[PDB]
Design a protein around this nucleic acid. Structure first.
Lengths: 342, 510, 336
DNA sequence: AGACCTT
DNA sequence: TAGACGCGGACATCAAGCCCGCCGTGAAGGTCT
C-alpha cells in the first residue's frame, strides 16, 4: 500500500484578521504600530556560567551590571477609543471526496468508498460542530481575549435567508458545548456545513466579526515574522490598509486555530493541531509517535479494514471510530500523503 | 582580466580564492602559468610545498566531480532534490525576452554534496588560457593538448596516471538525469493547444544567478537580499556568496493613480479579488508581483469549472487591474517530517517573500448569453500563487456580463487602479533593464513564460501522465496604462501562443 | 535537579503607559505638551582641561575655558493658571506562573508545577501580593514627580467588583507604613482578589489607576527618555491629536516590581532580577559567587520540596519568595 | 550510525 | 460706462556646538562509509 504519489488538498481556508479601532463618535481608523528601543539587563545564563557551574572569571559584579539595548515593536489601544473590531472570513468546500493525485486504482477507489461509508453510517454531525465551536468561541484570536473585559462574535452566513446570527458575551454565557446548541440558529448553520462536505461542488461562506473590549492602553498581540539571519526582535507581519501600516495576525495561524480538535490520543487532555505526527508546539514531544502505532500512516493502512467494520451493524465506536474521526480530520486539511518522498 | 596585477598588490591570500570561484569576472592564465596550476592542485583540503596531493588515489575523488557540473541547479530552492542537468537553451528567443540564451553559458558549478566541495577544485574552475574562456576538465581529456608538459613540470605524475586521464573523461557533456518519482521536484501542466497538455518543470540557471549577483552588489534601490541556511548542500555558487542572493527588488513603493479619465461581446467582470499571502519569488531571480503564468492558471482553472455545466465557455483572454500591491518577508513555517536518522524535526530554513494583491479581471469569452448568479460564485477557484482568493458577500452584486468593453470598465466600483501590458524594447542584458528602471521607477519585472530544453518526451511518472519537458524562466517588463480614450484594447487581453519552444504570455497586439 | 535547553514563562503582571493631562479650574482637561529649547553652558568637563592619567593640558588656556557650550534639550512644565495634573494606567494580574510555557522536559515540568502548588498551601500569597499592591497605592510609578510636590491622591477602580471606587488620599502623612493601609475600609477586599487571581486557574483581576498631582507654579515634569545632536529626547504618543510624553510601559513595570529586600545586605528594595543588579551603584548584590542568584536556587528546587512537608526557618522562606518573584516576571531560563 | 562541511 | 496703479538707496559684525557605556539566547542537514 501507500503508492509513490498521492495527494489531496484542503477543504477549509481562512484569510487574515485585520484590526480596526472604533471611536465614541462611531468612527473607524486602522490600528497602527511603531518601533521602540529599550534598555534591558544582563540576564542570560550563558553570560555568568559557562558549562555546568564554573562561573566565568571575566564577568565580574560590575560587568554584569551593565545594560544592553534591544529594539522591539510595540502596539497598543490608543487613548479614548471605544473598542477593537476584528474582521475575518472562512469558507468550506468538498475536496476530501476526490483525490488530487492518482496512478494506483486500488487505493483510489478505496479512499473514495471509505468517505461514502463514513458519510451515511456515522455522519458529519461530530466534526462539523467541533470546527464550528472553534470559530464561534474566539479561539482564532489566540491571546487577545485573555486580560479582556468581554467579546462578542457576529457571523454572516451565505447562502442564508434570515438575520445575522450573533453570539453575545462568551466568558459568562457560552461556556460548554451545551449553550452553543441552545441557540435558535445553531442547527441551520451546522447543517449547511454538512451540506458542504457531502455535496459534489457545494460551498459555504461565513464572515466572522468580533468586538473586543480591552482596558486602558492595553497591548495587542499579532503574529511575527520568520526571517532567518541593534538586533531587532519582534517584527510584526503587516499589510497596508488605507495607505497605513497594520498588523495582520497570520494567515496560516488562523488555520491552526480552527483545526485544534484532536483529543483522541492516548492521554487526551487538550486538543491538538491536526497532523500526522500529532506534535505539541509548547513541548517538543510527539503524541502519536510512529512507534505507538497511532500515527496517520498506521491508520491509513487499515483502509480496507474499516470498510469491513462499517458494513457490520455492530459498530464498537469506543476506540475504532476515534481512529476514523482522526482519519477524516486529516483528509479535510491534509494532502501530501506519500511515504518515501515529496 | 586581472592576472598578475591582482596576484601581487600585497593584500592577502584569499584574493585569488574569491577570483576562481565563479561569482566574479575571470582571469586569463597565460603568462604566469605553473604558479597558478599549483594553486588549484592545492585548493583541495582547507606553492610546491604542501604536496603529496598529486600522484595518488587523489584522482579517484578528483574524477568523480566532473560528472556533477550542473548547468542548471536542481536543488534550487529545496535542498533534497536529486538530479544532473547540463544542456543549453535549445533554440532562440526574440528581442524583448530576457533569459539565459541572451548571456553566454560559462559559470557552471559542482552541486552534489558537502564533502567534495574543496575536492571539486582543479577541474571545475575557469581560467581563459589564450583565446577561449574555458574550464580545466573539458580540456585535459585528449592527448595533443598543451599546458600538459607542465603537469610534468612537477616530477611526480608517472605516465601511467596519464593513461587514466586519456580514457576516463570521454563523453559526458550533454546529459539530463532527473527521475520524477520519488523526488521533490516541482512540476505543472499547461495547454499547448485546445487538444492536449504539456507538463514542464522549471529549473534555475546558475548563469543568471551569477550574472544578477555580481552586477547588483552596489545599488540598493533595486536589490533585495534572500538568505538560506545550508549553503554547503546547494553547491559552491550559494557558498561563495554564502546566503546572500541579490535579486532585483521591485524598484519603488507601489503607486495608485486615478484609474480612468473618461466622460460579439461577452465581457464578464470580477470585482476586487483580495489575495492573502501569495508568494513573490516568481522567477529564481526576481521579487515583486507574481508571475503572470499564475494569472493564466487562475483563469484556465476557472473556465474548466464552468465547463462542468455548459461545455462551451472558451474564455480566450483575460485582463488584469492591480489596485494594491505590498511585498514583505514573512517566513513560511514548514511542518515536521521524518528526517532520516531517527528523529522528527523540521526541514531546512529559508527566507520567503509574500505578497498581497487586490485586483479585478475582465474576461472576453465567446459565450454570448447570460451565465447565472449562483454557480458563477461556486465555480471560482480558491488560490492564486499559493494564496487565498475571496471577494465579499456584498460584492456579489457587482458581478455582471456585458457586450461592450467601454462600459465594462465603468462597472469597477473602486477607481484607483492601473492596467498592465508588456514593454516591447530590447533587453539583451541586465543593464538594459535597470537603465529603463531608473528613468521610470514604476515598472515591474516577472516571469511571463517558459523556455523548453526538450522536444518533449513521454516520462513515466509525469503529472497527469501527459508529456514532460524541462523549462527555464522568461523575464519580461510590465507597464502602466490609464486607458484614457484612445489606447486600443489589443495592448490588454493577453493570451498563450505556443511558439514551439517557449510558452510566453504576451498581449494580442504583437 | 538540572535545567533543560528550552524553558520559558510569561508575565503575570502587565502594566501600561501613564498618560498625562492638565486640569483647569473650569473642570476641563487637555493633554500635556513640550518644546525643545536650546541652552548655553560652560566648559565644565574634566576631560576638557586635563590629559588621560596626567597633568593639565596646555591648549585649555584662561580664554578658551570661558567660552560657551550650546546644546539643545527638551523641556516640559505645567502651564500657568492650571489646577493640577491627571495620570492614568491599568494593571492586569493573571496566573501564568502555575505551569511553564515551553519546557521540552517532562521531569523538570513536574517539579516546577508541584513547587507552586506547595507554595500556595503552606506559605500563602499574603506576603507577595501585599507588596505589589503597596507600590501601586502610593505612587512609586511616578518616580520623581512626587518629589517636591504638595500632595498627591490615588483612586482605584477594580474589576470584577460591586461597590464604590477605592481611594487613598494625602500620601505623605496618612499612608506611610504597612499598617497605614491595613487600617482601611476597603483593603482586605482587594487583596483576596489578587490572591484569587494567582491561586485559581483562569483567574483574572484588572485595576485601573488614576491620580492627581499638586505642584507649585510652572513646575517641571520629568517623563521617560529614549535610547539613542539632541540631549534629553522624550518618549511620545498621540493623545487626541497632539504630542505628549508618556512615562513608559516597561518603566512602570519596574516600579511595581521593586519588592526585593532579602539580599545579603538588606538595605533598599531592589528591582527583582536573576542576578539582582543595582543602578544607584553599578555593582551586583546576589552575584553567583555568593550562591544566592536565580540559577543556584532553581537547581536546588528538589531540596525545597522536602522542607515544606514543621515550618521552614527564615532564609528558606526568603529564598522561596525570591524564586516565586522571578517566575511571575518569568524570563526564558534556558542554558546550554 | 557518523564523518564530512564554508562565507 | 472710459481711463491711469511712480522713482531711489543701503539688508552689520562675532564667538562656541562637552561627554559616558552597553548591543542576550534555544530549535530546524544531505550523503557515502
Amino acid at each position: 500500500k501507500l503508492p509513490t504519489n498521492l495527494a489531496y488538498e484542503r477543504s477549509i481556508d481562512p484569510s487574515d484578521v485585520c484590526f480596526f479601532v472604533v471611536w465614541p463618535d462611531d468612527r473607524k481608523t486602522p490600528l497602527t504600530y511603531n518601533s521602540r528601543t529599550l534598555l534591558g539587563q544582563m540576564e542570560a545564563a550563558s553570560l555568568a556560567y559557562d558549562v555546568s557551574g564554573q562561573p566565568i572569571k571575566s564577568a565580574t559584579a560590575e560587568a554584569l551590571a551593565q545594560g544592553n539595548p534591544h529594539q522591539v515593536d510595540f502596539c497598543h489601544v490608543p487613548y479614548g477609543a471605544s473598542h477593537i473590531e476584528c474582521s475575518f472570513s472562512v469558507s468550506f468546500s468538498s475536496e476530501l471526496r476526490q483525490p488530487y493525485k492518482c496512478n494506483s486504482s486500488k487505493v483510489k477507489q478505496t479512499l473514495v468508498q471509505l468517505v461514502e461509508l463514513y458519510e451515511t453510517k456515522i455522519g458529519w454531525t461530530e466534526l462539523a460542530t467541533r470546527y464550528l465551536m472553534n470559530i464561534c468561541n474566539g479561539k482564532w484570536l489566540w491571546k487577545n481575549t485573555r486580560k479582556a473585559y468581554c467579546w462578542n462574535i457576529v457571523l454572516t452566513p451565505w447562502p442564508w435567508n434570515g438575520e445575522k446570527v450573533g453570539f453575545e458575551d462568551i466568558r459568562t454565557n457560552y461556556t460548554s458545548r451545551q449553550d452553543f446548541k441552545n441557540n435558535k440558529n445553531w442547527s441551520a448553520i451546522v447543517e449547511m456545513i454538512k451540506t458542504a462536505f457531502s455535496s459534489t461542488d457545494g460551498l459555504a461562506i461565513f464572515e466572522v466579526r468580533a468586538t473586543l473590549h480591552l482596558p486602558t492602553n492595553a497591548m495587542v498581540r499579532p503574529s511575527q515574522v520568520f526571517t532567518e539571519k541593534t538586533q531587532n526582535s519582534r517584527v510584526f507581519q503587516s499589510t497596508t490598509i488605507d495607505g497605513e501600516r497594520s498588523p495582520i495576525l497570520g494567515a496560516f495561524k488562523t488555520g491552526a486555530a480552527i483545526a485544534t480538535i484532536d483529543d483522541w490520543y492516548p492521554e487526551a487532555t487538550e486538543p491538538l493541531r491536526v497532523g500526522r505526527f500529532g506534535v505539541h508546539r509548547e513541548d517538543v514531544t510527539c503524541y502519536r509517535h510512529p512507534s505507538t502505532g497511532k500515527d496517520f500512516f498506521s491508520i491509513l493502512q487499515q483502509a480496507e479494514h474499516y470498510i469491513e467494520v462499517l458494513s457490520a451493524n455492530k459498530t464498537p465506536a469506543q476506540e475504532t471510530i476515534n481512529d476514523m474521526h482522526f482519519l477524516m480530520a486529516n483528509l479535510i486539511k491534509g494532502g501530501m500523503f506519500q511515504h518515501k518522498g515529496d | 582580466l586581472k592576472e598578475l596585477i591582482a596576484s601581487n598588490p600585497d593584500d592577502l591570500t584569499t584574493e585569488l580564492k574569491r577570483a576562481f570561484r565563479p561569482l566574479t569576472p575571470h582571469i586569463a592564465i597565460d603568462g604566469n602559468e605553473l604558479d597558478a596550476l599549483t594553486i588549484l592542485v592545492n585548493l583541495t583540503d582547507k606553492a610546491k610545498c604542501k604536496q603529496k596531493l598529486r600522484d595518488e588515489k587523489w584522482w579517484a575523488s578528483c574524477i568523480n566531480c566532473v560528472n556533477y557540473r550542473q548547468s542548471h541547479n536542481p536543488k534550487f530552492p529545496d535542498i533534497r532534490s536529486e538530479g544532473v542537468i547540463r544542456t543549453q537553451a535549445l533554440g532562440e528567443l526574440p528581442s524583448f525576452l530576457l533569459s539565459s540564451s541572451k548571456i553566454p553559458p560559462y559559470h557552471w558549478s559542482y552541486s552534489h554534496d558537502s564533502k567534495y566541495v574543496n575536492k571539486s577544485a582543479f577541474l571545475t574552475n575557469e581560467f581563459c588560457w589564450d583565446g577561449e574562456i574555458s574550464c580545466l576538465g573539458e580540456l585535459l581529456k585528449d592527448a595533443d593538448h598543451p599546458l600538459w608538459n607542465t603537469l610534468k613540470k612537477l616530477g611526480c605524475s608517472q605516465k601511467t596516471c596519464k593513461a587514466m586521464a586519456k580514457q576516463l573523461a570521454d563523453i559526458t557533456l550533454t546529459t539530463i538525469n532527473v527521475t520524477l518519482a520519488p523526488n521533490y521536484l516541482t512540476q505543472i501542466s499547461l495547454p499547448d493547444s485546445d487538444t492536449s497538455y504539456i507538463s514542464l518543470s522549471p529549473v534555475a540557471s546558475l548563469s543568471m544567478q551569477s550574472h544578477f549577483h555580481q552586477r547588483l552588489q552596489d545599488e540598493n534601490r533595486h536589490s533585495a537580499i534572500t538568505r538560506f541556511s545550508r549553503t554547503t548542500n546547494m553547491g559552491v555558487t550559494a557558498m561563495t556568496c554564502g546566503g546572500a542572493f541579490r535579486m532585483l527588488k521591485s524598484g519603488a513603493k507601489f503607486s495608485s493613480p486615478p484609474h480612468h479619465r473618461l466622460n460579439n461581446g461577452s465581457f464578464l467582470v470580477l470585482p476586487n479579488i483580495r489575495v492573502c499571502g501569495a508568494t513573490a519569488l516568481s522567477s529564481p531571480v526576481t521579487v515583486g508581483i507574481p508571475s503572470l503564468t499564475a494569472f493564466f492558471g487562475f483563469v484556465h482553472a476557472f473556465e474548466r469549472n464552468i465547463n462542468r455545466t455548459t461545455s462551451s465557455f472558451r474564455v480566450e483572454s483575460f485582463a488584469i487591474c492591480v489596485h494594491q500591491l505590498h511585498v514583505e518577508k514573512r517566513g513560511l513555517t514548514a511542518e515536521f517530517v521524518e528526517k532520516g536518522d531517527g528523529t522528527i524535526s523540521a526541514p531546512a530554513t529559508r527566507d520567503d517573500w509574500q505578497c498581497d494583491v487586490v485586483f479585478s479581471l475582465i474576461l472576453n469569452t465567446n459565450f454570448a448569453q447570460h451565465i447565472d448568479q449562483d454557480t458563477l460564485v461556486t465555480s471560482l477557484p480558491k488560490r492564486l500563487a499559493r494564496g487565498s482568493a475571496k471577494i465579499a458577500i456584498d460584492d456579489f452584486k457587482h458581478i455582471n456580463s456585458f457586450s461592450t468593453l467601454e462600459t465594462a470598465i465603468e462597472s469597477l466600483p473602486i477607481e484607483a487602479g492601473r492596467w498592465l501590458s508588456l514593454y516591447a524594447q530590447s533587453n539583451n542584458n541586465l543593464s538594459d533593464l535597470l537603465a529603463a528602471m531608473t528613468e521610470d521607477h514604476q515598472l515591474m519585472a516577472s516571469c511571463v513564460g517558459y523556455h523548453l530544453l526538450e522536444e518533449p518526451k513521454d516520462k513515466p511518472n509525469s503529472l497527469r501522465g501527459y508529456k514532460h519537458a524541462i523549462a527555464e524562466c522568461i523575464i519580461g517588463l510590465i507597464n502602466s496604462i490609464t486607458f484614457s480614450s484612445e489606447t486600443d484594447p489589443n495592448t490588454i487581453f493577453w493570451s498563450l501562443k505556443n511558439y514551439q519552444n517557449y510558452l510566453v504570455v504576451q498581449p494580442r497586439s504583437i
